[PDB]
Amino acid sequence: MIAMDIREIGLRLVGEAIKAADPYRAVLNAVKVSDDKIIVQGKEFEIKGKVYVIALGKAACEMARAIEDILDVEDGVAVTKYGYGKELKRIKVIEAGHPIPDEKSILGAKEALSILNRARENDIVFILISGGGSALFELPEEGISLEDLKLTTDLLLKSGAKIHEINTVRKHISKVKGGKLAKMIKGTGIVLIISDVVGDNLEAIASGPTVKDPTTFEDAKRILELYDIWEKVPESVRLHIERGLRGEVEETLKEDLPNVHNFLIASNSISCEAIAREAQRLGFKAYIMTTTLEGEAKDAGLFIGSIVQEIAERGRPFEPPVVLVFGGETTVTIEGKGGKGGPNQEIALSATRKISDLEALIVAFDTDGTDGPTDAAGGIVDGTTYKKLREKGIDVEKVLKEHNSYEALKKVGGLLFTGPTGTNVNSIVIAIVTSK
């Protein structure tokens, strides 16, 4: 087909990853509607009643809007952050607190329970989940106030508690977390989830209101005691947990519910696949190297750069033209003040020397639109970048040591600005080699 510079190709692939992660588009890509059938990622469901919507997270309204555009919704609620508003046709919108829950969070949860009380065994209920659902959508167990929750969560952090141990305790004092929301669905539950978690563990997203929770009340008590806060937490918390130990209150979801189906519709992997698919259409062989890349940014750039070197030099592990995709979320370790920059900018800049003079390009970007404390989403460099940096008398190693990669990339057209993206499935590095 038509010819394209390696840069147009790279930017084209970046656009594909972002589109595949768009909450609105992601829902439409996953949910297809016939005349009486709803097909979610291949799974077919017959419409034998009404359709309800319960959305929670930063993209609640956008996801809800997609459902309303392809299905008539009897009623529902969308709980999102303050400012994320955006009106809907038949779905009530509520803005709540985040990262700290407030009374609106409770109001949202109560609104959701009301809807589930009305939905019948023959109705379909869409549960739309995105980031921030834990604070935005919450309803404490009996006798427990939002303030009791705050104090408990605070004592957990104050005493240094592992994140999953905190989720265990929180899941056991919430009426909707730990699969409890799914337990309230009388009909068919179709859950659409967007993941901003490396590895995509559903138990963590919004505290898994529709997924199983293997932890128990006993685990929660052990944890509070282990950190000597069992006596420090409010009486209402100890009481609810003791009641759980006595079997007076239901446990968090332990088994699978044949009527509630969880679908992950936007994630780093889904965006990487969108990249590989487009790459193949453009005539490249494409490979997803990983979707769980973690570690120091600078070093990730050296490692990806070393593979690019091997490919351009010996045609292994793959023969060009080829596209390699690395997803995950790297980090920059700063011991001091540091300069201007971020992870993806350091990945890109660090790789410049190893790909110097090669017919290759590396673009590393964060799908949420920002990288480090800057307005750039990441960096984009090619085989000419290193020499352009040297021509301006820039010492790359020194720049990286000072963690001031933004300033270096800024001078050689190496910054990637996406502006607001409306989503977050973490970062992706695309490496392109067009020739040896």
Swiss-Prot record:
GO molecular function, one term: ATP binding
Documented EC number(s): 2.7.1.165
Co-factor: note: Magnesium. It could be replaced to some extent by nickel, manganese or cobalt.
Record note on pH: Optimum pH is 7.0 and half of the maximum activity remains at pH 6-10.
InterPro entries assigned: GK-like_C_sf, GK_N_sf, MOFRL, MOFRL_assoc_dom, MOFRL_protein
Membrane-traversing stretches: none
Cofactor(s) it depends on: Mg(2+); Ni(2+); Mn(2+); Co(2+)
Swiss-Prot/TrEMBL catalytic activity: (R)-glycerate + ATP = (2R)-2-phosphoglycerate + ADP + H(+)
Similarity comment text for this entry: Belongs to the glycerate kinase type-1 family.
Known partners and oligomeric status: Homodimer.
Job description of the protein: Catalyzes the ATP-dependent phosphorylation of D-glycerate to 2-phosphoglycerate. It can also utilize GTP, CTP, UTP, ADP or pyrophosphate as phosphate donor.
Name of the protein this chain belongs to: Glycerate 2-kinase
Species of origin: Pyrococcus horikoshii (strain ATCC 700860 / DSM 12428 / JCM 9974 / NBRC 100139 / OT-3)
